[PDB]
Design a protein around this ligand. Sequence first.
Ligand SMILES: C[C@@H](c1ccc(F)cc1)n1nnc2cnc3ccc(-c4ccc5ocnc5c4)cc3c21
Length: 327
Amino acid sequence: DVLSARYEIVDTLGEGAFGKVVECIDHKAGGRHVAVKIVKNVDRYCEAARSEIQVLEHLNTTDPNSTFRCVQMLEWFEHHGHICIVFELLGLSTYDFIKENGFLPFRLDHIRKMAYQICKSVNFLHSNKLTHTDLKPENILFVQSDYTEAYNPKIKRDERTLINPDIKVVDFGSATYDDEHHSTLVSTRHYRAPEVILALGWSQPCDVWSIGCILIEYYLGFTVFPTHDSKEHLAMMERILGPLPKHMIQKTRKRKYFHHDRLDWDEHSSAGRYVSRACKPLKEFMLSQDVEHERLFDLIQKMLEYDPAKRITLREALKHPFFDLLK
Ligand SMILES: C[C@@H](c1ccc(F)cc1)n1nnc2cnc3ccc(-c4ccc5ocnc5c4)cc3c21
């Protein structure tokens, strides 16, 4: 298939509820390939795609050189009733890279620069009265996914090391302005903030919670929330972070999760023993007591503050000691 008389599909990069993203040759322009998002002809996804186009048009006007590392939209059009958005071609997602590495975690120096760029990008959105709402490693993509495969003696396996860890943030179809309607449920479950789970209302801080989850995943290679159930997810939080704040518990209407304004959770049920084996207090996940591991986990703990009003902002996160070896 050849959209818009110039774009020949050569590969499908990824597929989702919205449609797919394909890699295309541009037969009119010089031959650097592009990424093309082809949106399903369903109202739900059409409307998100038009919102994405509006957001990216305004971000391109404010930040035409992508200083703040949002993916660059090159053009958009309609084709057989599908909205098609042409993007600069990026490399693998940060999730794809970890997975293809056998779920080996990223090196701390790479985590530092990736976290910085992520916080920079999302803080730019937040500066602009926008919340992303769907931050996850799948929506953080490497500008170039080239690697060197080195022998790692510890322990005895070949491992892939990023040549350049620069990223960009993608997927603005769920992004929500301060004054716009806020969806009831946002984010992918493992990155979803507690105020979303408890239906208390959400704003920019829910992005910070997701980034905190992303950072631990980069550090560990796996999610600390291996769950597909909301009450179990809350039990995992309490295992990692301590009890939920009482003020959040009495404000929620999610009464099925609570007994006497405490989480209705049997730690000695079968699911309770699953949680106890999969999760543990946050700092027990640290693999070193070195000061820069300590500052990463201090940053993560501040991003995983339960109360969205007390959670660190990305403006404050950007000044965190963890990022010093970058400056
Ligand atoms: C997880 C992600 C994604 C989807 C497909 C894919 F191949 C890679 C990433 N994703 N999930 N939901 C959405 C919505 N809109 C988008 C718009 C663009 C891109 C995007 C942009 C440039 C790319 O360069 C290479 N893959 C890319 C994907 C991804 C998305 C997108």
